[PDB]
Design a protein around this ligand. Structure first.
Ligand SMILES: [Mg+2]
Lengths: 303, 598, 377
């Protein structure tokens, strides 16, 4: 009942994606007329935008006013009547289960069988049970079992690593033996920060623009490995190393390393330093508390 | 982490989970797809009528749930909470009959700012949209008299997704309308502000309207996107994500006005304003892990001194498991998350409604797929303090007529006295063990059977040249002398009989089958001797039955007989028909027939 | 590259080769008799001769894996060995007996039409096995050529021990069996088609055996006017049956539960004890080495970053003994409840074990229950 870390069984889900995006094409085409192939799916999915440190969103202002009813029954079935027969052609080439599939999604129903729930192959169903027991045990604080699940899982040849948060909080609460969650995280960053599609949402990413999760988590978690202290000029030494200038959150990591090192004229230079990286962190999508938690600490320091 | 070392690595707390407390409350293509336009067919919430507004009484708690063969009647009735929530003592459910099936019921409630509470409850059918006033419940007998704020069957021949609330707001697939409800009696409901969010390339029918901040500004949803509409000016916004990697899965307003709970796929989203104007929240969130389209959500809200914490129940239509996460509102508009937990429920089916109302108590009701029952549940933190009607099998066990009761009893008596015959019968056979009588019997037995076996081997010689098959007729047996089996009663001398019978017919062209390697399949460990078989079974059953020695002997006898080999003339006879069938076949299938591969 | 239009030869060669491979594993690892092999050459020879008495270059043959298991069971049943279908389902679902891969990863490249003819129709789990063995039993005739009487009494023993029933129920059910049949049990249910709608949900012998078994327990226990079987011991029996313990068997039935089509049984993997899950991962690192299909050494060191990793678990007759003792305290209308929950648990075990449906089983025991009421009234 949990996400599987394998590429999905191929045959039928792809031809359903065909039927879906092809019908989508015909209906939206005739819709723009009335307002006047993997590649078909590709263009179709294509033309579309693809007091604490909140990486704030984009709120509501400068957005266009309204629309008033576009779609009555008669007008909609006008737009629907023709693209459904065009669909009658390749529906004849696909399988019966996918006939009924298309007829149902095109009626507007939603399937209550998942892609996982209908893979129904030995090895994959077994991996489903394995991964499930991982997620369950990790919920159940059973870090020992959960760890066995995780190792046996990553052994399997099909699973690429989404499961890194599983192991991050896993070895974190484990404390037992193996090179800990920091080791794993900086490993994730060292292996997957260089060139050295289907499967890729944002919690595993490529180093063109932001590789997110693992990087910021080893960053903050390493500054907490300084919370173990009171190492710092190390963490901000290799935060000083990379150029990826848009990485504002690593600018607040930087300035946080300087505030933690500022806790004599050396301490001065560290306080001027954090004062700088806060504005070159106003460079990008802001992490702000105010000016008073930023500075008022630094005036308690100016003491 | 975030605030703990922004201040200047485990958590904030130790590790605590889920428990139950259960109770009954009330009773009332398609295999692979579902209708999104049917959200929830029962609500329960605090309502407050006019006569409740003369005094200071805080109204009452009511339930409204759908009923009927076609699910086309509304039932409204009052609750009284004492030790645990329960239906009223006089059980006078007030049900009103419609002719259209009920797809959605919700009772709206009200903000804390108005002082009042809702007086009404509204429903979407397959044919109409109706609003009901509850007017003047009275304790004389717990009556709930309601009035029918009039339907509007259809204006557009369009089904309507969601109703939100004095303001009757409707959404039909793509296009919405703000409207108003008449006052009490007998003019019905009108509108004048309208709009649409239509999107040709989203096929799923469900959209959703619920507003936001009580600011007189609404939210409209489809599985593609979330659109805010400031609707007493002219204002519209598509908030920041769209339809790239996940679908909007549900949204419900976490009860406090400025508070928003949205299930995506693999994300619990806590939208809610931290500005007077409407908002998004990207105050980070948790994620929950499927492809399931059928996920829904609800929150319960518990109050405490140092925080204000919200429990998020995400449930499904596929499995009876409930997936829970918890958030906290330390009103610096502070939100943090702690760790996940999930519970199960019971056999086949799944939730159609989950509805909420140094430890945590959170309580709700559930209604399961295809089960008219409504079950109250409660959940606690620590511990300081099947009733089978499977109608498929009971219909198979309870068979009706009285002669079909005394029929079964008749058969049971027949076999029971028969079993007495078995006991008394074999008893004396057990009295004679290692006797000279049982020796005589094992002799004339073993070689009497040897004589019959030879006869059957002669009548296997006459029919030997069949060569059409390779299985001799009715082979493996005692060979038509049956009384000779039973009468002995000493397993080891009988195993020795058989070993010396196999020894005796070692004159070739005869079957050989080693039992031990097959008892391996019975007891699941190596069973070398035919005796140790009897030993192990006798341990097991000597723990449990009288005359376990007699039965265990009768059953090791029955087994050893059931398997007592004597199949066709052996390995040299099969190869004859093997090759001769490998002849009548065409020449290159004969070339494909291949022994010893690799 | 790969053959065209007469890779019938290569097809039947990978098929036959896979068969003899499985036989090697069952004489070897299951201590079968060597005679089985010749019986298999005879049955596979008969249907090989029948498909090579068929003309068309259009293949029209369906040598699915169910045919492999079908001729194994057919031959085993001729030889009257006390193996039953559930032995096979267990054997293959636990990856012991090689099954799931057309020539497992290591072979031959064949026309993708035949690779699909193998990988497809792989599951036995809705009675596909019973239907395919009756289908083979038509394809070449059971009656004269072979002896298609099932090894009934060992299945009774298998069944009583599989519950924890006292040995009286062996003779009970054996007697109801003789009552409706007088012990005559066939293998064909064949009239080559797909069509069937009455009389033929219940004519695979085993399913009727299970049906008599269930019925027996219900009748017998609900009419012990003697009061021989206490209102309690039915509960203690249900609980000793329910206690998830870690023997080879129950661990196996968990492994089968994982690939059974219908819920609940997968909710059953949800409710595994810690030891069940542990012995599970054990079976995963043992029998999912039978898996299928620079940076590579970087993943040998990468995976070698976290460890890949006096016998506690007890045997079968040990567990059996101990629940027999767990009820050893042996010496009013809501006891029907105890009857019913016991029957439904037993049913559950049989459904996963014999790879059929809830609806299938209750269809059969319903039909044959009315078939005993009819010859009783
Ligand atoms: Mg968009």
């Amino acid at each position: 009942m949990f996400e599987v870390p394998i590429t999905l069984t191929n045959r039928k889900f792809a031809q359903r994606r065909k039927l879906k995006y092809q019908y989508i094409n015909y209906i939206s085409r005739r819709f723009d007329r009335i307002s006047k192939q993997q590649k078909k799916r590709r263009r179709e999915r294509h033309w579309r935008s693809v007091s604490f440190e909140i990486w704030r969103t984009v709120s509501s202002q400068n957005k266009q006013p309204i629309n008033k009813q576009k779609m009555t029954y008669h007008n909609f079935k006008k737009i629907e009547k023709i693209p459904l027969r065009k669909m009658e052609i390749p529906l004849l080439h696909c399988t019966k289960e996918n006939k009924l599939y298309f007829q149902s999604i095109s009626r507007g129903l939603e399937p209550l069988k998942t892609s996982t729930s209908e893979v129904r192959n030995y090895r994959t169903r077994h991996i489903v049970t394995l991964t499930d027991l991982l997620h369950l045990n990790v919920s159940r604080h059973n870090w020992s079992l959960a760890y066995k699940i995780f190792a046996t899982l990553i052994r399997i040849p099909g699973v690429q690593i989404k499961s890194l948060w599983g192991i991050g909080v896993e070895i974190l609460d484990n404390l037992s033996n193996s090179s800990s969650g920091l080791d794993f995280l900086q490993w994730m960053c060292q292996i997957y920060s260089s060139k050295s599609r289907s499967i890729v949402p944002p919690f595993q990413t490529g180093s063109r623009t932001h590789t997110a999760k693992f990087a910021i988590t080893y960053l903050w978690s390493s500054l907490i490995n300084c919370q173990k202290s009171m190492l710092i000029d190390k963490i901000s030494e290799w935060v000083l190393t990379p150029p990826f200038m848009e990485d504002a959150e690593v600018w607040f990591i930087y300035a946080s390393c300087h505030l933690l090192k500022a806790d004599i004229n050396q301490v001065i230079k560290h306080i001027h330093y954090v004062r700088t990286f806060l504005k070159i962190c106003l460079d990008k999508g802001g992490f702000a508390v105010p000016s008073r938690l930023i500075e008022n600490q630094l005036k308690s320091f100016e003491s | 982490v975030q605030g703990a070392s922004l201040y200047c690595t485990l958590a904030e707390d130790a590790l605590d989970l889920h428990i139950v407390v259960k109770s009954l409350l009330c009773d009332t293509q398609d295999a692979f797809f579902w209708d999104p336009t049917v959200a929830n067919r029962l609500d329960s919430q605090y309502i407050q009528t006019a006569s409740d507004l003369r005094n200071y009484r805080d109204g009452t708690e009511i339930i409204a749930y759908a009923s009927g063969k076609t699910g086309s009647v509304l039932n409204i009735a009052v609750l009284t909470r004492q030790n645990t929530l329960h239906l009223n003592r006089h059980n006078n459910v007030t049900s009103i009959e419609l002719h259209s099936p009920i797809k959605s019921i919700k009772i709206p409630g009200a903000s804390e700012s108005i002082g009042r509470r809702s007086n009404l409850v509204g429903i979407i059918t397959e044919n109409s949209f109706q609003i009901f006033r509850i007017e003047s419940v009275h304790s004389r007998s717990c009556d709930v008299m309601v009035s029918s704020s009039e339907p509007l069957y259809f204006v557009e021949i369009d089904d309507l997704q969601v109703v939100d609330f004095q303001f009757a707001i409707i959404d039909i697939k793509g296009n919405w309308s703000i409207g108003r409800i008449p006052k009490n009696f007998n003019n019905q409901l009108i509108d004048n502000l309208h709009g649409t969010i239509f999107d040709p390339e989203e096929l799923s029918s469900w959209k959703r309207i619920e507003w936001f901040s009580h600011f007189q500004k609404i939210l409209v949803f489809d599985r593609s996107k979330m659109i805010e509409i400031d609707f007493m000016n002219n204002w519209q916004t598509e908030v920041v994500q769209a339809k790239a990697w996940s679908n909007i899965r549900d949204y419900k307003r976490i009860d406090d006005k400025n508070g928003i709970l949205l299930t995506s796929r693999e994300i619990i989203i806590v939208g809610a304003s931290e500005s007077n104007d409407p908002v998004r929240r990207i105050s980070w969130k948790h994620d929950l892990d499927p492809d399931d389209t059928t996920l829904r959500i609800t929150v319960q809200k518990v109050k405490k001194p140092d925080h204000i914490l919200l429990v998020a129940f995400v449930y499904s239509m596929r499995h009876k498991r409930i997936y829970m996460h918890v958030f906290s509102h330390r009103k610096a508009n502070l939100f943090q998350s702690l760790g996940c937990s999930t519970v199960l429920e019971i056999p086949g089916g799944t939730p159609t409604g989950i509805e909420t109302i140094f430890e945590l108590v959170v309580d709700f009701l559930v209604k399961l797929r295809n089960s008219s029952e409504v079950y109250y549940y409660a959940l606690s933190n620590t511990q300081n303090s099947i009733i089978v009607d499977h109608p498929e099998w009971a219909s198979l066990f309870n068979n009706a007529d009285e002669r079909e009761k005394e029929s079964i009893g008749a058969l049971v008596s027949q076999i029971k006295l028969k079993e007495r015959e078995r006991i008394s019968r074999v008893q004396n056979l057990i009295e004679h063990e290692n006797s000279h009588d049982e020796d005589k019997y094992l002799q004339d037995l073993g070689y009497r059977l040897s004589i019959a076996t030879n006869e059957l081997l002669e009548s296997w010689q006459k029919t030997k040249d069949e060569s059409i098959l390779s299985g001799s007729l009715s082979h493996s047996k005692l060979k038509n002398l049956l009384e000779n089996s039973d009468s002995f009663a000493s397993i080891p001398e009988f195993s020795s009989l058989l070993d010396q019978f196999f020894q005796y017919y070692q004159d070739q062209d005869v079957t050989f089958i080693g039992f031990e390697k097959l008892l391996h399949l019975f007891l699941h460990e190596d069973v070398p001797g035919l005796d140790i078989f009897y030993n192990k079974l006798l341990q097991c059953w000597v723990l449990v039955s009288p005359q376990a020695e007699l039965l265990t002997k009768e059953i090791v006898k029955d087994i050893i007989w059931s398997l007592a080999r004597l199949e066709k003339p052996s390995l040299f006879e099969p190869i004859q028909n093997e090759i001769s069938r490998s002849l009548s076949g065409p020449y290159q299938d004969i070339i494909s027939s291949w022994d010893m591969d690799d | 590259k790969l053959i065209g239009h007469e890779a019938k030869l290569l097809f039947l060669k990978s098929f036959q080769f896979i068969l003899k491979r499985q036989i090697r594993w069952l004489i070897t690892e299951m201590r079968f008799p060597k005679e089985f092999e010749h019986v298999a050459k005879i049955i596979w020879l008969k249907i090989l001769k029948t498909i090579n008495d068929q003309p068309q270059e259009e293949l029209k043959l369906q040598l699915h894996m169910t045919s492999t298991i079908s001729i194994l069971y057919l031959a085993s049943t001729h030889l009257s060995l006390p193996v039953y279908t559930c032995d096979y389902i267990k054997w293959i679902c636990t990856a012991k007996m090689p099954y799931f891969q057309a020539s497992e990863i290591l072979r031959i490249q064949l026309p993708n039409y035949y690779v699909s003819i193998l990988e497809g129709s792989i599951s036995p789990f809705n009675g596909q096995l019973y239907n395919k063995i009756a289908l083979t039993c038509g394809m070449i005739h059971f009656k004269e050529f072979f002896n298609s009487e099932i090894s009934c009494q060992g299945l009774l023993l298998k069944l009583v021990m599989q519950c924890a029933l006292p040995p009286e129920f062996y003779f009970y059910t054996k007697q109801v069996i003789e009552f409706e049949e007088t012990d005559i049990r066939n293998l064909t249910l064949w009239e080559r088609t797909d069509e069937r709608h009455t009389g033929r949900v219940s004519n695979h012998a085993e399913l009727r055996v299970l049906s008599y078994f269930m019925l027996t327990i219900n009748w017998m226990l609900s009419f012990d006017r003697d009061r021989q079987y206490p209102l309690k011991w039915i509960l203690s029996l249900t609980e000793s049956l329910t206690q998830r313990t870690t023997t080879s068997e129950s661990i196996g039935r968990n492994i089968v539960k994982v690939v059974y089509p219908d819920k609940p049984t997968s909710s059953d993997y949800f409710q595994w004890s810690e030891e069940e899950t542990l012995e599970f991962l054990k079976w995963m690192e043992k029998q999912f080495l039978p898996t299928q299909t620079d940076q590579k050494i970087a993943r040998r060191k990468l995976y070698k970053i976290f460890p890949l990793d006096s016998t506690h678990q007890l045997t079968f007759i040990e567990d059996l003994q101990e629940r027999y003792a767990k009820q050893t305290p042996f010496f009013p209308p809501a006891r029907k409840e105890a009857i019913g929950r016991l029957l439904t648990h037993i049913a559950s075990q049989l459904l996963v074990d014999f790879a059929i449906s809830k609806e299938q089983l209750k269809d059969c025991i319903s039909r044959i229950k009315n078939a005993c009421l009819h010859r009783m009234n």
